[PDB]
A paper describes a structure:
The [name] is an endoribonuclease that recognizes ACA subsequences within single-stranded mRNAs and rRNA precursors, and catalyzes the hydrolysis of adjacent phosphodiester bonds. , In turn, the antitoxin MazE prevents [name] catalysis by the formation of a protein–protein complex that blocks the access of substrates to the toxin active site. Each monomer is composed of seven β-strands forming an antiparallel and highly twisted β-sheet, followed by a long C-terminal α-helix. The toxin displays a large concave cavity at the homodimer interface, whose central region is characterized by a positive surface electrostatic potential, while the edges are amphiphilic with positively charged and hydrophobic residues. The N-acetylated and C-amidated synthetic peptide, named Small Antitoxin of [name] ([name]), interacts specifically and with high affinity with [name], preventing its ribonucleolytic activity by competing with RNA substrates for the same binding site.
Therefore, all biophysical experiments, with the sole exception of [name] kinetic assays, were carried out with the catalytically less active mutant containing glutamic acid 24 replaced with alanine (MazFE24A), which resembles the WT protein structure and leads to homogeneous samples that are produced at high yields in [name]. Structural deviations are mainly seen in the β-strands S3, S4, and S5 that are slightly shorter in the peptide-bound state, which causes an elongation in the corresponding interstrand loops. As in the unbound state, [name] adopts a helical conformation when it is complexed with MazFE24A. Two molecules of [name] bind at the dimeric interface of MazFE24A, where they form intermolecular contacts with residues in α-helix H1 of one subunit and with residues in α-helix H3 as well as in the interstrand loops S3–S4 of the opposite subunit. The binding site of [name] is the same one that accommodates MazE subsequence 54–67 in the MazE-[name] complex. The aromatic ring of [name]’s F4 is buried into a hydrophobic pocket, in which it gets close to the side chains of V108 at the α-helix H3 and P59/F60 at the interstrand loops S3–S4 of the same monomer. The side chain of [name]’s F8 is sandwiched between the aromatic rings of F60/Y39 and the aliphatic side chains of M38 and P59, indicating that this residue may have a central role in toxin binding. At the α-helix H1 of MazFE24A, the side chain of K42 is in a favorable orientation to form a salt bridge with [name]’s D9. As [name], the substrate makes pronounced interactions with α-helix H1 and the interstrand loop S3–S4 of the toxin, and thus, upon binding, [name] blocks the access to the toxin substrate binding site, a similar inhibition mechanism that should be employed by the MazE_54–67 polypeptide region.
Numbering used by the authors:
A (entry chain A), C (entry chain A): 1 to 18, 29 to 111
B (entry chain B), D (entry chain B): 1 to 12
């Protein structure tokens, strides 16, 4: 069996850098480059302008949209934990767009 | 954009 | 003298991670968080969809817009080397926006 | 967007 998981947008993955992360880039990109864009999650909701609270009960369930980073997802050990809700993914993207200007 | 950065400044 | 350089958008900085980088985030953000968004530069132009060739003659003068990353600019030693042209900065941002979707 | 990803696919 040769096929293996490749992150897709909206995936919540366990990764060694920025442990939970939300994938923003699409499968077509992630499958060809070995990289994906992702946003790290942390524990505490603070009302920080760039945070997005994720539904569910996970320990690290606040995404920090401003700390987006390209990561080499194979080398960092990306394992899929689940997904975020579409509305959460869209709020993350909107906040990054504001930062990029 | 303008609303967002107003809120950012206010937060900090 | 207490004031020190804080990156601003369009700055080309020498940084220890992703050596030359283009700053995308604005001073108001960079000055409060200790972080900025930046894109790494590399040597070779390949026609890669996410590359943006920078004017000038520097060794690492091709920005890889898809490898944007939040960096802790003080800890990575950000020193200003110069600037990129406005049109180059706008092409980088547009390409990141496509990746974010 | 559509043009861009067409070009990306073609490149690879
Ligand atoms: Na595949
Ligand atoms: Na200052």
């Amino acid at each position: 069996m040769v096929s293996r998981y490749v992150p897709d947008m909206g995936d919540l993955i366990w990764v060694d850098f920025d442990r939970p992360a939300v994938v923003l880039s699409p499968f077509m990109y992630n499958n060809k480059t070995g990289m994906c864009l992702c946003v790290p999650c942390t524990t505490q909701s603070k009302g920080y302008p760039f945070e997005v609270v994720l539904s569910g009960q996970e320990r690290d369930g606040v995404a920090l949209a401003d700390q987006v980073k390209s990561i080499a997802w194979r080398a960092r050990g990306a394992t899929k934990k689940g997904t975020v809700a579409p509305e959460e993914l869209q709020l993350i993207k909107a906040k990054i767009n504001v930062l990029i200007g | 954009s303008h609303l967002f950065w107003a809120q950012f400044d206010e937060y900090f």
